[PDB]
Every structure is written in C-alpha cells, then in structure tokens.
Amino acid sequence: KIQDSLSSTPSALGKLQDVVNQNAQALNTLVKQLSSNFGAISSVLNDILSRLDPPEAEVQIDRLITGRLQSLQTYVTQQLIRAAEIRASANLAATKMSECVLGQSKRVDFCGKGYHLMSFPQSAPHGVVFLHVTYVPAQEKNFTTAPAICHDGKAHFPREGVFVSNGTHWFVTQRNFYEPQIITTDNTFVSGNCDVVIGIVNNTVYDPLQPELD
Amino acid sequence: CTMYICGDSTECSNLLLQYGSFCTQLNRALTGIAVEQDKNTQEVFAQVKQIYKTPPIKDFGGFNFSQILPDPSKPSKRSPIEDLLFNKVTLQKFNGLTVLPPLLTDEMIAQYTSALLAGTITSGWTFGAGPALQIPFPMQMAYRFNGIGVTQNVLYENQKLIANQFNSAIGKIQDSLSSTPSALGKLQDVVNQNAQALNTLVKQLSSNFGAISSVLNDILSRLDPPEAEVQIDRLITGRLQSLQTYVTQQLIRAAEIRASANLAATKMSECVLGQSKRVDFCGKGYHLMSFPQSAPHGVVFLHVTYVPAQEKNFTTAP
Amino acid sequence: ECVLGQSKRVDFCGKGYHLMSFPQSAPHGVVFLHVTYVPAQEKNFTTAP
Amino acid sequence: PLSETKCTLKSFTVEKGIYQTSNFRVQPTESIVRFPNITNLCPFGEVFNATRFASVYAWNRKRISNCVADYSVLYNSASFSTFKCYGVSPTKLNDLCF
Amino acid sequence: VNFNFNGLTGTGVLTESNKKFLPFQQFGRDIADTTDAVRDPQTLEILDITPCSFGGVSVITPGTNTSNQVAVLYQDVNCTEVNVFQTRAGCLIGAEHVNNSYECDIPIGAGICAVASQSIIAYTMSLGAENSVAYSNNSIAIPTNFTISVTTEILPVSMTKTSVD
C-alpha cells in the first residue's frame, strides 16, 4: 500500500517539492533582479560603461551597485533563515532516526501514529522518507470491569493488566490485546483488606498450588 | 507596497516598479508566515480527527473536572479556566498594514481542546494511538501511577485523598492565575512585541529619510516630477528599507514561534495523548498527564505531577 | 533528561545505552560527560522462539 | 479575477488555493477644491517694481499675507531673466496655499 | 472624492465627527503624520477625512487545470459596498454557502473553506466526525484484534548548495 500510495497520489512528496521549489524560485527572483535598473538609465553595466564616461557614469553605476547589493543582501538573508529552518528539520530527522530506526521509542506519535514498533529510512532527493511500522488496535469489545478483586477479605490487584468480565466470569487480561486468563495468584498481588477500596467485586482467585496439593 | 510606500499615487508606484520583484518577495514571505501560523495552530491542536464529547454525568470517582470542561452556561462554550485566561490577556490598521483573521476560530479551537479533554478523561491515552477505548478514571489514573513506579494500591487505598488534592490544586490554579499578574507573561510579551513592531513600522512614515517632507502627497503637490524623482526615490528607498527590516525581524520571530509551536505540539502529543517518561518535560516532578487549555495565540497546559512528600531515613543494604 | 534522570531515547545522552551524565561549566558553554553502558565480547548461540 | 491571479503568479497553471492580489479601492468620482473668500491682491507689483531697492546691507523685507497672489503674471513675464525655485515647482506654485 | 483643502491635498470621504476641536487648531493628525480631521473655510465645520474604504482582494481558485470558475473574497468588508456570502473575514462572492460540513479544501478565513458539483461552495469547516464514547464507572473497552500500519513521514535534510560571488 505504501508503494501504491506513493506511485498514485500526487504531491505525496510535497514536503520536499516545496523546499526545492522555494530554493529554485528564490534563485530565479535573484536572477530576475538583474533585469531591473534600480532607478538608473539601464540595468546592464556594459551599456552605461559604453555610452557614459566614468566621471558621470559613477552615479549610475553606484545606483546599480547599491540596489543589486541590497537585493543580494535580501537573498542571502532569506537563504540563511531557510537554512536555519532546514537545520531544525534536519536535527528533528536525525533525532527521529536515532530514536525510531536505531531503536524503539516509547514517545507516543513521534514515530508515526499509534504505538510504534520500528522504522525504515529511505533516501530521497535532498531528504529522507521514514516508514514507521506502528501497531494499532482495530476491533474493541466492551466488558464489565472492577479495580480490585476481594478474596477472603484480602484485596487482589492485577500484577500487569486489568480485570474484565464478559458479564458472567472474571478474567485478567493485558491492556492492549484481549487475551483473558483465569485469575490466579501469579498475575495478581494482595494489598490490605477490601473495605477501603471503592467499587470492587467479591470473587475467587485461584491458587495454583492447591490442585497439585490435592 | 502600493498602499504602504505610496498609497494612492501612480507617480511613485511607477518608480517602485523599477525596483524589481521586491514587492512580490515581501508579500510572499508575509503570506508564508501567515499560512505558517495556521499550520502551527492545526499541527498543535488538531491531533485527533474525531471530536469527542464529555459524558452528560460527571461521575469520575471524585475528580471534580467541572473546572476544565466547557461550561454550557457560558455563552462561548469555554471552561472557567480558559475564560480566565482569555480575560487575563489583553490585546496599525490604516496604511494597508492589515491583519487577517486566524483560520481556526476561538470557538473551534476550544472545541478541539474540549475534545482532547474528553478523550483523555474517557479513554486515557489510547485515543491518541488508535480508536478511543473508554476507561474509568480511577483505573486510568492508577495506570498512570503504575507508569512512574508506583503500584496501583497506593491510588486505590488513597483514592479519596488523591481526588481531594487534585481538586484543591485545580482550584489553586485559578487563584494563582487571577491573583498573580503576568501569569500569561510569555503570551503578553509576544503580542506586545508584535504590536510594538507594527507601531514602529507605522511610525517610520513620520521620517523624511532625506526627503523634504515625510508625506509624499505634499511633495507631489509642490514639486515638478523631473526633480521630484530624487526626493521620492530617497523616500521610497528609506521606506522600503524599513519594510525589509520589519519583514526580516518578523521572519526571525516567526521562526522562533515555529520552534515554540513545534515544542508545544510535541508536549501536547507526549503529555496529553499519553504519559511521558522523559523527566522535567511535562512539569516538575514525576508526570501523570496534562490538560490543554486554549489561550489567545497560545496554549496552556496543566501538568499533573506526582511529587514525593515527607521522607523517612532508613538503614539499608544493597 | 540525562542529568536529573536517566533517559531511554537512544543517542540522546551519548553513544550506547545511557547510564547517567555529569554537567561541567565551560566558557560560554557546557560540557556533558555522558557515562554510558556499551556491551562487548559477544558470543554466538543457537536460540529458539 | 482569474486573469489577474494568472498575471500576479506570472504563470498559467494556478495551484488550487487562495491568493491575495491587490486592494479594492473605489476611485474618486470627482475632484473638489476648497479655498477661502479672500479676494485682495498683495502688492507684488509694488515689490517687484519698487521705486528704490535697498542695498544688501539693509535689504528690504516686505510681509505678504491675507490675500490671493497671481504668480502667473510674473512667471509669464520674461522680464525676470533668472527664476530659480527650490523646494517648490514654479509651474504649480499658484496651486498651493501658504 | 479627491479633495484639496487649502493646499492640503488628499483623497477620501468627508464625514461628520464628534471630535470637538478647540477654536484655535485647524486640522488633526493621526500617527505617522497624516491629516484626519479638518475645518474648511466658509463654514468652519469640523469635517472628518477618512480614506475611501479600502480592502484587500483575494481569489479562491480550484485550479485552471480543472475549471475557470473563480470565487472572489473581499475581506473585512460588509456586503453593502460593491451568490454572496458574509464571513467573519469578509464577504466572499461567487460561491454558494451550504449547511453540510466537509473537510477543508481551500482555506478562506475564520473556519470557512471552499469546486464541487459544477459549482464553487463555501462552507464552515467540518472539525471531524463527532464521536461520543460510552463512558461509565465500570465499563472497559479492550481490543480483540489489531492492525499494523505504515505511514510515510517526509523530512527535508539539505538544500541545494548554492553559492554567489
């Protein structure tokens, strides 16, 4: 689908075409400034040197030199600002490479939308294109849940995951993929008694030792 | 250009055409930073496509969120804190120097903020990753403790206390903002310096730049062209130089604003849309979560940070 | 992210797995000493899912 | 407006978007000039045709105010060999008020 | 009108103003030394000079490669100074304001965006598909299946190494 979208959708590489176009168009405007006479009798130096002796051609060539110098100053300033912007973007790209390609980053939506798995770089003309292989849940189911399980007075909390029920039986499951498991003492831990924590349910928590005991 | 340098006068407009593409250059740069403003706002706020809506009943296990959710009784559908922020920030238009309105109006910006608050409250962080997955707030905040090495039991056995502390802190936010002047100092500084730059740019028209008068109308009325050219050329040169200086400084200030907006977007993405581990990036102390709040030409976060309290010494062995 | 606490974003507090860091004042600057954990002396093994 | 956009963008293919082109300024429909009821003529004849001119040591100065002055006659009169004006153009010197 | 007030040339509109001049001064000035009020001869009334109501002109165009239909936006001007739709930014003519909401195509100003069905439409932006979430104090949503998506993120690193002597 990546190759299909890249081949079919135009302006997919707009983030690069814009900077290329800006550079080329700035250069074009810089060239076009030569055509403007900046208030003097001609915009070409050879004419004013050819048909004006130096003592009064000084003023004309001075007008041209100062105007064109100011235009070059403006062009260089624009290039410097754009180079600073590209420098910031390049530092961002380097950070993204070192945090998404060279390793896995837990920073949400810094290596693509959704939970991030890995990334693949691809060289682009004056740029880099990232392929952020990310993990996204699709289909979700509702369940009745409870922050705790009270067993023989002791509370029980999930060591990792949450408590969920399909309406009739309870289960422990991880928080990003429904994978119910019967509640045993291995994936839950006890903390105090079950009269201080609100909104909890009475239930039983299995003990794996007992089935082999008996 | 035409209005700024010359206003209603073809006489100097003709001479201004002699300076080439300066005008299209400046107008293009200003349009670029203008559209970059809208890009910043959209990139920093529109992080979720689907607008979420808070549940009709505020049964969040004791956390009094009424201070940050939009208030229907308010005519502008803004929460009390955002209304206080708007009331705390206080905000040239005659010589062609106009101001275009922002693309995202304050109402829809507040709508994004309310959607983000509802998403965080109802689904924790999953709504920033994929589909929204509703989570009751005690469990969501128990997980957010679980992300900074504090097991769930601390929260569950201290639920009433933590809820009361959070409510009290939210209230103190209003008290701090209302009683402390310049609490919005950054936004006030940026708005004030932008308006001051505009005022200086306008004031530049009160300068002769070598000409015999600072208003081109009277020199046009009292000077024969074939010698008025030099005077009006000095005036145009100076005024255009001032415009270039203004545009350049605006470009640099807009680059700074771009950096700040990218930082703001990253902060919202990492602290709002999820819990961020990088210390001292989502507020002093261990971080839990945060709330965006729309502010005039800015954004205000409420970093909810867990901070240890009175400590006991112990004799320990590795 | 490096001095006041330990970071996990790779290649932000020095090459390799990051342990901690020390700031040092420098004329118109700062010099960090990122102390990082870098493995070595590897051995091949047969492994299974 | 489409042709004006083509003109400003210096191209034919215009990208899909919004483009600012110029400023809408309704032109003036007629021209009006307002000047006071003054009708007296200041003695320009008595100054340019004084009986005796004072020497530069005691150059004579004559105030002129509260009248209407016709620089047209003196400008057209070629009796003045040199007529050099700085800061104001002699052609429309009759236009302004002082 | 193009007016000439005692040599004080200018262009604009003369209106009535509550600016009560003291009996000595003639004409008032705004910042940047421009004439804003004046008392004229033969009536001495305090006329207020205001430049004829200006306004920028913008063009929404969907692209000449697709159509020649053009929408004209006269920003910050009420529709009493020449379909026609008023906006918070100005009045945009040449488009039909609709009630349905779509994603933005061409920005216009103040939450308004614009060819569709042989005509140019101007509409309030669709901020996104509204989606409430069935919250409660004991309801959990847990996915049963996932999907892996790859997104292309594009960042410039370098520009053309230009040089000028």
Curated annotation (Swiss-Prot), chain C:
Function: Subunit of the fusion protein that is processed upon entry into the host cell. Mediates fusion of the virion and cellular membranes by functioning as a class I viral fusion protein. Contains a viral fusion peptide that is unmasked after S2 cleavage. This cleavage can occur at the cell membrane by host TMPRSS2 or during endocytosis by host CSTL. In either case, this triggers an extensive and irreversible conformational change that leads to fusion of the viral envelope with the cellular cytoplasmic membrane, releasing viral genomic RNA into the host cell cytoplasm.
Glycosylation (residues): 44
Stretch of the intact protein here: 1031 to 1079 of 1273
This protein's name: Spike protein S2'
SS bonds (residue pairs): 2-13
From Swiss-Prot, chain D:
Region (Disordered) location: 25-41
Glycosylation sites: 29, 31, 37, 49
Effect of residue 45 to D: In strain: Omicron/BA.1, Omicron/BA.2, Omicron/BA.2.12.1, Omicron/BA.4, Omicron/BA.5, Omicron/BQ.1.1
Effect of residue 45 to H: In strain: Omicron/BA.2.75, Omicron/XBB.1.5, Omicron/EG.5.1
Disulfide bond sites: 42-67
Subunit composition and interactions: Binds to host ACE2. RBD also interacts with the N-linked glycan on 'Asn-90' of ACE2. Cleavage of S generates a polybasic C-terminal sequence on S1 that binds to host Neuropilin-1 (NRP1) and Neuropilin-2 (NRP2) receptors. Interacts with host integrin alpha-5/beta-1 (ITGA5:ITGB1) and with ACE2 in complex with integrin alpha-5/beta-1 (ITGA5:ITGB1). May interact via cytoplasmic c-terminus with M protein. May interact (via N-terminus) with host bilirubin and biliverdin, thereby preventing antibody binding to the SARS-CoV-2 spike NTD via an allosteric mechanism.
Protein purpose: Attaches the virion to the cell membrane by interacting with host receptor, initiating the infection. The major receptor is host ACE2. When S2/S2' has been cleaved, binding to the receptor triggers direct fusion at the cell membrane. When S2/S2' has not been cleaved, binding to the receptor results in internalization of the virus by endocytosis using host TFRC and GRM2 and leading to fusion of the virion membrane with the host endosomal membrane. Alternatively, may use NRP1/NRP2 and integrin as entry receptors.
Name of protein: Spike protein S1
Taxonomic lineage of the native organism: Viruses, Riboviria, Orthornavirae, Pisuviricota, Pisoniviricetes
Gene it is expressed from: S
